[PDB]
Design a protein around this ligand. Sequence first.
Ligand SMILES: Cc1ccc2c(c1[C@H](OC(C)(C)C)C(=O)O)[C@]1(CC2)CC[C@@H](C)CC1
Ligand SMILES: Cc1ccc2c(c1[C@H](OC(C)(C)C)C(=O)O)[C@]1(CC2)CC[C@@H](C)CC1
Lengths: 141, 141
Amino acid sequence: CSPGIWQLDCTHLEGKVILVAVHVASGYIEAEVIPAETGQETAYFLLKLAGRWPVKTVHTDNGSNFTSTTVKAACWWAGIKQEFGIPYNPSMNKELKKIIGQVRDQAEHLKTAVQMAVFIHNHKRGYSAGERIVDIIATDI
Amino acid sequence: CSPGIWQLDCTHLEGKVILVAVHVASGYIEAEVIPAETGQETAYFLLKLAGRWPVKTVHTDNGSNFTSTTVKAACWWAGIKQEFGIPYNPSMNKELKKIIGQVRDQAEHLKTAVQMAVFIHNHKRGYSAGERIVDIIATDI
Ligand SMILES: Cc1ccc2c(c1[C@H](OC(C)(C)C)C(=O)O)[C@]1(CC2)CC[C@@H](C)CC1
Ligand SMILES: Cc1ccc2c(c1[C@H](OC(C)(C)C)C(=O)O)[C@]1(CC2)CC[C@@H](C)CC1
């Protein structure tokens, strides 16, 4: 609901790892294939994300993702706090996997199809996710 | 001046290649270390960028960057045209290298320092580049 909240999760496809970041208020997605589920990969991704968008808090469906000192150092440097207002009651990852499968045959590498699917998701329409995120953030200013 | 214009260039540091994308109207930067100056690296970067921002035209200071069929295919799929309104009369890359040098000792890897410098650049103040780009794009809507 708030404009600075992002949710980060990893999902798996074709034996590879996809890190998926969702801007909760807009549905806008940032995703990319990473070599492994490691603290260093998560930390580097957070640093990239935080330099491109105003990231205030981060949530996840796997709390242990954020236990490594390397991730904690990346949140510390970027001024990112953990999100505590989003409960866990056991979506976009399935929508993303659906789009990836639709375009998968158009690219050789999974990482390319992932970026094609991010493009499709963020620009699909009644605004698009890419339109909503900028309107939410700009309005917050 | 127009909200869909980006300029892409590669610069070199520590024997590595930095791809730098600048949103011309705002000064907002996206940058990352890439293994080599190749058409495939440029194409993948453009696909990523185009899924995150509304990219209409792309300029560069090295026209031959955009001659590979692989880059042409990435522009074709994302609907990106070449920018023809920005002449070439022989800046941000120097500002970026300045910031990188300031933070370089705080990280082991150059790629990390680059993302730290992107963060510093985009959030430095009279708005910041990250504030201007969202205001420009949102206003365009
Ligand atoms: C390797 C490779 C070779 C050639 C082409 C592609 C690629 C993709 O890999 C890179 C993004 C790293 C260049 C891929 O994974 O096939 C295109 C078309 C032409 C790029 C644009 C895409 C929209 C379609 C796939
Ligand atoms: C390898 C490595 C190991 C440990 C730490 C870091 C790193 C950096 O590399 C990754 C971003 C890939 C994790 C680096 O290049 O040193 C930090 C602190 C702790 C991450 C946060 C940064 C703001 C400072 C450097």
